[PDB]
């Protein structure tokens, strides 16, 4: 790798690993449209199995970028419109509080205080319907953002419906396959388990628990190579041959909502570039949404019990980074490390 990349990556990530006691990490830097890979530590501590470029990590909430782009690919196809009411895709949602709640609201976390997590007791499809039917907004829809899995989880599940495909299959056939993300999974196959890192919560080896709407919100697993490829695809959508997927990516980076200095996209979140880490670490809709601004810090954090992940990229600079850890360390530390690297190479 270019020495200048080697230099900052090693000086930045290595101590980050020791401070946070991360068992294993993989990093990718996208520099002038090429990826460079870095690996440290262990995917499985007990078996002394090292992290490689083949290692699967849980992406957690970074999954939502796939979801957003898939939702975006659906808008481009004409299958859905953000303005569509929720009840158009789930007529069974008859309770009056859903009157006027739209896909936009769901996608942007502005439905009115949908909760952080779908409650644990929700297991069946009828549990899920009962949960949303009995939920009462904490404030008016369309007025105030509260980040929520039960919000973007629902959006992704609804956005696939016109297509007739399950969310898992829309995701695989419209997003994963056309971008050759051949080692990116919602469900890891038996033969890939040897590549699936263990996550580490309080010293014990864990893996993400099944939960309702887990696929849509936090359940993707991927390798550093595929995630680098995911960043290349979002950095340069124009290289993508499939037109709806090209527009889908672009729409995901539109700005639909501003809160403080942050802009809500579909999955992706954004800040005007340049910004300093402190600001990465006034509340209103943007109508119509601002088309994607190339001078942006486009990013997303992700966590599960045993994993911490981060992706960020600046389109203007054709620059990006992916950091995948099998331990869930604090988000500020991720944004500090990444900004240091991208800023050094800017």
Curated annotation (Swiss-Prot):
A beta-lactam binds at residues 61, 117, 147, 149, 303, 328. Its EC number is 3.5.2.6. Keywords: Antibiotic resistance, Hydrolase, Periplasm, Signal. Pfam families: Beta-lactamase. It is found in: Periplasm. One of its GO terms (cellular component) is outer membrane-bounded periplasmic space. Belongs to the class-C beta-lactamase family. This is Beta-lactamase. It comes from Escherichia coli (strain K12). The gene is ampC.
